[PDB]
Amino acid sequence: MQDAITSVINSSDVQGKYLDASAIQKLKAYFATGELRVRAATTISANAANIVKEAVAKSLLYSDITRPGGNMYTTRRYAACIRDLDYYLRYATYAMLAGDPSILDERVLNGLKETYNSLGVPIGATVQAIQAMKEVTAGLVGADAGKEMGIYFDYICSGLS
């Protein structure tokens, strides 16, 4: 629903005004980052299955959670946890290409705290995995897009915890 171009539109809409001078340069600030967000989103989409498989090995394996009793023990749950982590990556590349972090509250963090509390998912192990994921995808996109990617993980990461 809420984009970045729509954000300066909808703030201008409820005033009933038009595109003012401050509303244009903020809108042109999104275009100046336009080559960065497109080129980084091609890089993550080409390396989706490798940025996931490093992030689970960096934080989650060889612990209590991959042993019996842990929440990623069985082959249902460890195959679920890759998919349940891969939605955090794919929607974060939506929020970079949108340029606004409000796509996460519409479609990721809505009932997510109510699920994992009812499921017995360790939220603090999830937020450790996304925090390990945020470092390794900063090395694949460079330091310019690494700040813009690094914001939108920690909008997910504070919605969990």
């Binding site: 629903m1 984009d3 970045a4 171009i5 729509t6 539109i9 909808n10 201008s12 809409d13 009933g16 038009y18 595109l19 244009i24 809108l27 042109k28 999104y30 275009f31 336009g34 080559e35 497109v38 989103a41 091609t42 989409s45 989706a48 794919r90 590349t93 939506y94 290409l97 949108a98 340029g99 796509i103 479609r107």
Partner: protein
């Protein structure tokens, strides 16, 4: 914004954005400042647009100002130009967005009921947007006015 509906089309099939859509993003952005000066002519001449569009509104359908209708009297005709002001603000958003989804989220998805519950016939409204079509495209060079004409005509097709 085109970056809205190119996400929700990729979110509908649980997919990443295809590189056949990534060049639609990038070529929108680098040509995005072209859309700014198109929209600056709209807000730069909004009083010019609203004056010489409502005159031919009462020439192709000259009976809305007649009594027994809605827009008879000074206050009641002023709600038409109050509602004519509410249209071209969205098409100013519609030029800049690249998609027509600010016009979808604000000003079309209840017009089919909210006007016949108010007393304004849509076939008179659809003339009033196309009366603006003859003057808003005329206030811009026809290369840049061709794609500028390619947004509010969707609203007339969504009225008719």
């Amino acid at each position: 914004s085109i970056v809205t509906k190119s996400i929700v089309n990729a979110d509908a099939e649980a997919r990443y954005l295809s590189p056949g859509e990534l060049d639609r993003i990038k070529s929108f952005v680098t040509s995005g400042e072209r859309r700014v000066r198109i929209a600056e002519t709209m807000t730069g001449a909004r009083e010019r647009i609203i004056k010489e569009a409502g005159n031919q509104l009462f020439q192709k359908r000259p009976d809305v100002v007649s009594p027994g209708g809605n827009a008879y009297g000074e206050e009641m005709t002023a709600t038409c130009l109050r509602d004519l002001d509410y249209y071209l603000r969205l098409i100013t958003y519609g030029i800049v967005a690249g998609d027509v989804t600010p016009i979808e989220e604000i000003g079309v998805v209840g017009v089919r009921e909210m006007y016949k519950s108010l007393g304004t016939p849509i076939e008179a409204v659809a003339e009033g947007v196309r009366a603006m079509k003859s003057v808003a495209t005329s206030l811009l060079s026809g290369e840049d006015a061709a794609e500028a004409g390619a947004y509010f005509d969707y609203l007339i097709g969504a009225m008719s």
